[PDB]
Amino acid sequence: QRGGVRQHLANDRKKIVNLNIPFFPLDRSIDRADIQNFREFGTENAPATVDAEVQ
């Protein structure tokens, strides 16, 4: 009703947050005993080589 009283507002809202990140390693090693005598698979007589294994 006119003249009597008034009303008011409300002051918003907020929030903040933070997070963490994981870590994913992966390693692989090679040695002599792996590639000495074995045939290069898929070939009749070719000997093995390091490059094929590394790739």
Next chain:
Amino acid sequence: MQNGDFQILDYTGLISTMPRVDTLLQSMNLFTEHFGRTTVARIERLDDGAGDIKAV
């Protein structure tokens, strides 16, 4: 020709028939031919894949 001994005939030729043969697959060129030297053959197969990576 001659019917019996004292009579003649009219000759109308020969009729011939052959059975069916199917050639569907040969028309598709689906196979590859190799000519070897002996009665033994060898084949080699190789498999590969991947794996998981867990958090550390």
